[PDB]
Amino acid sequence: VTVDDDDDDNDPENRIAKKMLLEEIKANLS
Amino acid sequence: DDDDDDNDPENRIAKKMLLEEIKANL
Amino acid sequence: GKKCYKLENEKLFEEFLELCKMQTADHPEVVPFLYNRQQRAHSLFLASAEFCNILSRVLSRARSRPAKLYVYINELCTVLKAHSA
Amino acid sequence: GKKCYKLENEKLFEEFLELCKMQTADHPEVVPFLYNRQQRAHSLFLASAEFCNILSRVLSRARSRPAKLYVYINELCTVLKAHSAKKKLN
Ligand SMILES: [Cl-]
Ligand SMILES: [Cl-]
Ligand SMILES: [Cl-]
Ligand SMILES: [Cl-]
Ligand SMILES: [Zn+2]
Ligand SMILES: [Zn+2]
Ligand SMILES: [Zn+2]
Ligand SMILES: [Zn+2]
Ligand SMILES: [Zn+2]
Ligand SMILES: [Zn+2]
Ligand SMILES: [Zn+2]
Ligand SMILES: [Zn+2]
Ligand SMILES: [Zn+2]
Ligand SMILES: [Zn+2]
Ligand SMILES: [Zn+2]
């Protein structure tokens, strides 16, 4: 099994929430 | 002049009270 | 969600302060004192429906009964002090 | 009227941001993004027991389960967005 740079992936709900939030922030919307 | 603020007794008391409150907070 | 009345209450309060500026002009200390009472009140009260209704009521009462204006100012001052931060 | 929580909510929001600073150093954009949502929110919400409840809840949950931090951040973002007073600038 491969590891990556971060430590946010153990919980699948957290991994999804993180992806969604970072995409929201990157978009620079209201 | 009965149009003076102090004509209505409630208004007379309220006005005296308010102006004294302002003086007390100087 | 709940309506935030911050801006509507600023508008209404300025409208009442204008009436007071016109009708208590021989006591020019009244308007700045009432302004300062408003500025010191809790943020929640300043944004509340409670304050909105207080302000619309005092404007209406003042315009109907100029002979009672200091009753209405003194009452509003007391309300503002009761909600002071 | 109802109890004002303006200052308590500022303290609690700062505690949550500090928690985010400890755990999101690899995405430095998260903390300023949440701060921007706080700055754009309606005054009534910022002073409310409603906001106190949310902050108390996400602080407790984030301290109990740090591996779910972003779940709780998203919850805070969503409710701040629901109480936004103005659009984001620049
Ligand atoms: Cl609400
Ligand atoms: Cl507003
Ligand atoms: Cl407060
Ligand atoms: Cl609200
Ligand atoms: Zn990863
Ligand atoms: Zn990490
Ligand atoms: Zn709300
Ligand atoms: Zn005078
Ligand atoms: Zn307050
Ligand atoms: Zn007073
Ligand atoms: Zn009250
Ligand atoms: Zn990032
Ligand atoms: Zn507002
Ligand atoms: Zn969950
Ligand atoms: Zn969001």
Side-chain angles (χ1 to χ4, degrees):
Chain A
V1 52
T2 299
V3 303
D4 67 12
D5 283 355
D6 71 79
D7 56 2
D8 299 311
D9 297 330
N10 282 328
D11 181 279
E13 195 187 14
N14 195 59
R15 193 171 182 169
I16 294 167
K18 177 181 171 193
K19 186 181 228 291
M20 191 184 307
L21 179 71
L22 297 181
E23 283 173 2
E24 173 182 356
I25 297 178
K26 171 178 179 188
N28 194 42
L29 302 176
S30 295
Chain B
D1 185 10
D2 295 291
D3 287 329
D4 184 277
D5 290 320
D6 302 345
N7 180 260
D8 182 82
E10 198 185 20
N11 198 63
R12 171 171 62 239
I13 295 167
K15 178 180 185 176
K16 178 172 184 176
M17 277 188 35
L18 179 65
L19 295 181
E20 296 193 348
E21 177 187 349
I22 298 174
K23 187 181 169 189
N25 283 267
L26 283 173
Chain C
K2 291 193 169 75
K3 169 68 170 178
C4 176
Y5 288 95
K6 185 185 180 282
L7 293 179
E8 297 306 319
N9 291 347
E10 287 176 356
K11 192 173 168 187
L12 285 167
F13 183 75
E14 290 168 25
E15 190 182 6
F16 184 66
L17 203 63
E18 172 181 56
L19 185 154
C20 291
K21 184 173 180 73
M22 294 170 63
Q23 291 178 33
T24 64
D26 51 349
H27 291 284
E29 69 273 32
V30 168
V31 161
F33 189 81
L34 195 61
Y35 175 75
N36 288 324
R37 282 261 185 256
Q38 180 229 18
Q39 296 286 296
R40 292 188 144 205
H42 276 288
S43 186
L44 189 78
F45 178 77
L46 289 172
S48 68
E50 175 191 20
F51 193 28
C52 191
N53 288 326
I54 282 164
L55 288 166
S56 64
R57 180 166 176 265
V58 72
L59 268 163
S60 174
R61 292 170 86 207
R63 286 174 173 156
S64 71
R65 296 187 85 185
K68 297 264 195 188
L69 179 56
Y70 279 97
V71 181
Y72 306 145
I73 296 169
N74 195 43
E75 283 174 356
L76 181 59
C77 182
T78 297
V79 166
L80 286 167
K81 181 170 187 175
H83 296 84
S84 166
Chain D
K2 287 173 179 167
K3 177 172 167 190
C4 185
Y5 281 90
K6 182 183 180 281
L7 297 183
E8 178 71 1
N9 291 344
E10 284 171 358
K11 173 193 83 173
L12 294 174
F13 185 76
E14 179 55 72
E15 288 182 21
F16 191 75
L17 284 191
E18 174 76 7
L19 193 156
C20 291
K21 292 182 188 180
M22 294 301 102
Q23 281 185 251
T24 63
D26 47 355
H27 295 283
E29 72 272 23
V30 168
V31 162
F33 173 85
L34 293 175
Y35 175 81
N36 178 258
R37 283 224 185 277
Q38 180 206 213
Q39 295 302 113
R40 290 162 51 211
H42 276 283
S43 187
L44 182 73
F45 180 64
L46 290 173
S48 67
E50 176 193 4
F51 195 28
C52 180
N53 297 339
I54 293 156
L55 291 167
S56 300
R57 184 177 59 81
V58 295
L59 276 167
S60 176
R61 294 289 199 182
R63 292 162 172 157
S64 293
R65 289 189 173 87
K68 283 185 174 277
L69 178 57
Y70 277 96
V71 179
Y72 310 130
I73 295 176
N74 257 315
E75 288 169 2
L76 177 58
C77 181
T78 296
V79 72
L80 277 165
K81 184 182 188 290
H83 291 89
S84 186
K86 60 185 180 187
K87 296 290 192 54
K88 187 165 185 159
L89 294 173
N90 297 332

